[PDB]
Amino acid sequence: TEFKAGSAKKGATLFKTRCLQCHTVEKGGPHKVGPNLHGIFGRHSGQAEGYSYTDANIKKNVLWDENNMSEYLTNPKKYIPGTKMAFGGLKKEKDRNDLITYLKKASE
Amino acid sequence: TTPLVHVASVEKGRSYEDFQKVYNAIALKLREDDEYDNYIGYGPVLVRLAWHISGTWDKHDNTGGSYGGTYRFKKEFNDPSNAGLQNGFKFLEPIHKEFPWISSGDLFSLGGVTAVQEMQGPKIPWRCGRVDTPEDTTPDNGRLPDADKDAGYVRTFFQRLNMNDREVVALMGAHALGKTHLKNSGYEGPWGAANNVFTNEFYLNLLNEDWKLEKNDANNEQWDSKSGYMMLPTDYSLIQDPKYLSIVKEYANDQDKFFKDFSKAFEKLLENGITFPKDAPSPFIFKTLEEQGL
Ligand code: HEM
Ligand code: ZNH
């Protein structure tokens, strides 16, 4: 697509190091600082299954596809202002593609 | 025969724009060398470097502090409580070759300010003027705090840096950044989840989580939560002391208040022991990479 596709092994280590402290990927997942992200692609934002999101994450209500997700992970607070996801941003495109490719596979 | 007066002298024909270039350079390298410490980056170690070069001050006789840039000398460089800081010094040497005019003290302190601002922290007013001083003004090892202590120690340790109760609780909130490394200090693990972004997580974790005292692998005791976080004995002592506790609860409720007191305190920490003559320029507020389109 507009976003290419990378290594799912590299993205695994990127998730483990930069996203795991707050998230899970598993079928029936331990909700943490952040939501369980299984089945993220194809669903809306603020879209629970049990979790307290800020009204900003709910009201943005965008379908999570590979492309708008990449724009989010570059700068979470610029894309969805007022969010409580304390993350600086993946500033390198390879890192975003390597991660989303792992995420698409892990959150199937 | 008279005490030490450390007069701030601006580097010959340098101004804001000169210093904004050194900031940009540090800030970009922070963005590019992002793999460090399992993707935490160099942000946390640069603010710890800014604090440890400033933490050597002793108000009584005006020795130590940021001014002299004396961290570059092997006596202070090899201080056992400065373990792990070489990585921060290594990050700053290529930038120093790029700008050989800037003093060592000015670079280490700017590195800390840059790290905080870049990690989405509050804007911290910064001043230039630190001048490099000889190898004989290098402070003796042991002027930095020990982690295995209580609130009493912390209150009196900081009296030496001229810091009040409000200032020490604010400065400690910097522990929302990074982690403790067993190879460097004998303690292992993070204080929170968002290790490279500046928030009030420190205080929220301190009173909201379930803390259990345990032993790590280096044979030292530390407070561990079920969520994977840790707290040093001095960090925990901030909730044991009734006076420190009500300032911890204040910051856990209001991040803005926390963002305003730290910046006042952090600036004061880096400016300690320096005399700025009245002709000196007003403190600089640098623009982040995000404010410049990056
Ligand atoms: C590369 C790593 C990361 C990825 C892939 C990721 C992804 C996401 C996504 C897609 C959402 C939206 C969920 C939805 O709309 O259902 C989200 C929300 C959230 N994330 Fe993560 N995240 C990462 C790292 C972090 C970190 C480090 C923290 C924790 C300190 C965190 C905390 C949260 C929180 C708390 C929310 C809810 C936001 C709100 O309600 O405003 N995330 N994240
Ligand atoms: C009481 C007192 C005190 C004490 C003892 C301490 C201690 C500590 C320790 C033990 C550590 C670890 C090391 C390693 O590497 O392992 C840290 C870190 C630390 N720290 Zn800090 N601190 C303090 C204060 C402080 C302040 C004031 C600040 C600033 C402002 C800080 C900031 C810090 C940081 C940021 C860090 C992280 C780094 C890294 O991660 O590298 N801090 N500490």
Which DSSP string corresponds to B152-220? Answer: HHHHHHTTTTT--HHHHHHHHGGGGSSEE-HHHHS--EES-S-TTS-SSHHHHHHHHS--EEEE-SSS-
Cα–Cα distance, B216 to B182 (Å, whole number): 9
Residues 6+ apart with CB under 8 A from B19: B102, B110, B126, B128, B284, B286
Which residues on chain A are in Cβ contact (under 8 Å) with B190? 21
- Neighbouring C-beta atoms of residue B285, cutoff 10 Å: 12
Please answer whether residues B248 and B33 qualify as being in contact, where contact means their C-beta atoms are separated by less than 8 angstroms.
no
B6 is in an annotated binding site: no
Domain B145-265 superfamily per CATH: Peroxidase, domain 2 (1.10.420.10)
Rounded to the nearest angstrom, the gap between the alpha carbon of residue B235 and the centroid of all alpha carbons in its chain is 15
Strand partners, B63: B58
**Domains and their CATH numbers in chain A:** 1-108 (1.10.760.10)
Radius of gyration from C-alpha coordinates of chain A: 13
For a ligand 1 pocket test, name from A22, A25, A63 the mutation site with the most ligand atoms within 8 angstroms of its C-beta.
A22
Say whether domain B4-144+266-294 belongs to CATH 1.10.520.10.
yes
- The enclosing H or E element of B222 equals strand B221-224
Which DSSP letter does residue A24 get?
A: B
Which DSSP letter does residue B72 get?
A: G
Q: 3-state DSSP call for residue B110?
A: helix
Cα–Cα distance, B15 to B17 (Å, whole number): 6
- The enclosing H or E element of A105 equals helix A93-106
The dihedral sign for the CA sequence B100, B101, B106, B112: negative
If you measure from the C-alpha of residue B211 to the centroid of ligand 1, how many angstroms do you get, rounded to a whole number? 25
Contact B201 A86 (CB under 8 A): yes
Cα–Cα distance, B244 to B240 (Å, whole number): 8
Rounded to the nearest 10°, the torsion over CA B96, B97, B99, B104 is 30
Cα–Cα distance, B145 to B51 (Å, whole number): 11
Residue B14 has φ and ψ, to the nearest 5°, of -115, 155
Which runs of consecutive H residues, i.e. helices, occur in B196-285?
201-208, 233-240, 242-253, 255-270
Domain boundaries, chain B: 4-144+266-294, 145-265
Cα–Cα distance, A102 to A89 (Å, whole number): 17
